[PDB]
Amino acid sequence: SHMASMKHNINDNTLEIVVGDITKETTNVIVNAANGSLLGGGGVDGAIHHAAGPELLKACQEMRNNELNGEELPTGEVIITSGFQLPSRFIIHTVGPIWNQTPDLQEELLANCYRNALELVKVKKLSSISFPSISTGVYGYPIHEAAAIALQTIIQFLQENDVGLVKVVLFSERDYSIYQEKLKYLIEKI
Ligand SMILES: Nc1ncnc2c1ncn2[C@@H]1O[C@H](COP(=O)(O)OP(=O)(O)O)[C@@H](O)[C@H]1O
């Protein structure tokens, strides 16, 4: 099947948007739009658990019990695990905002997912990362607004930092089309 894609170079970095299944990406890191409980759900988190195999859930729950001391992973924060059966080396787990639960903070919190994940890529001297459309499925964040926040945040980070390749993997042509129109718009302002 055809997979729409476009790329833009930002200094020595490359930002790519693509249609695809994030579990098939061979980037160093893939990002899971995780649940706060770090339990496996449906959606992209469910896909990632199914593709990674049963060691993922076990790893995440060990991390919940130890470094998080039974607390939920806070919105906009990150943890990192191995990739297990995924073709990536690592999975960065992040929790996006649930749409309009916290209206005053949710733009910042969504941005935090991207910023915190990208800083962690830098810290570990990894050079490629794939993001899904965080919060625009069951979490209900309007795709038109989320895409703006995701892209602005990524573009800003890549303007100030050497990372390598950042991919956003969209699961539908509609989401890709929105991302494409937003990315083209933001490129024009640079
Ligand atoms: N295998 C997959 N690869 C990439 N994206 C996916 C996959 N499965 C679902 N998605 C997309 O991930 C986005 C977030 O959906 P969801 O998993 O419900 O996350 P959230 O709970 O953060 O909204 C949605 O656009 C959904 O279509």
Residue numbers in the entry: -4 to 185
Share the article's original sentences.
To expand our knowledge concerning the field of macrodomains, we have characterized Oceanobacillus iheyensis macrodomain (OiMacroD), the first to be described from the order Bacillales. A yield of 40 mg of pure protein per litre of culture after a simple two-step purification process was obtained. Its phylogenetic analysis revealed that, among the six different classes previously described for macrodomains, OiMacroD is included in the MacroD-type clade, together with other previously characterized MacroD-like macrodomains, such as hMacroD1 and hMacroD2. The subunit has a mixed α/β fold, similar to that of other nucleotide-binding proteins, composed of a central seven-stranded mixed β-sheet (β1–β2–β7–β6–β3–β5–β4) and five α-helices.
The crystal structure of OiMacroD-ADP provides new details about both the mode of ADP binding and the role of the β6–α4 loop in this process, in addition to the data shown in the archaeal Af1521 macrodomain by Karras et al.. Interestingly, the OiMacroD-ADP complex showed two alternative conformations of the bound ADP molecule, in contrast to the single one found in Af1521. However, a detailed view of the pyrophosphate showed that it remains slightly distorted. In this case, the β6–α4 loop was completely closed, as expected, over the Pα and Pβ, but lost some of the interactions established with the pyrophosphate, especially with residues V133 and Y134. In the second conformation, the ED map revealed the ADP molecule to be bound to the protein only through the interactions with the adenosine and Pα moieties, whereas the Pβ is projected from the active site, remaining exposed to the solvent. In this alternative conformation, the Pβ lost the rich network of interactions characteristic of the ADPr complex, essentially presenting a snapshot of how AMP could bind to the protein. Surprisingly, in this second conformation, the β6–α4 loop remained closed and fully packed, due to a main-chain H-bond between the Pα and residue V133. Taking these results into account, and the fact that no binding of adenosine alone was detected in Af1521, AMP seems to be the smallest portion of the ADPr molecule that can bind to macrodomains, and is specifically recognized by loop β6–α4. This fact also highlights the essential role of the interaction between the Pα and V133 for AMP binding, which acts as a trigger to induce β6–α4 loop closure. Thus, the β6–α4 loop seems to be able to recognize the AMP moiety even when the Pβ is absent.
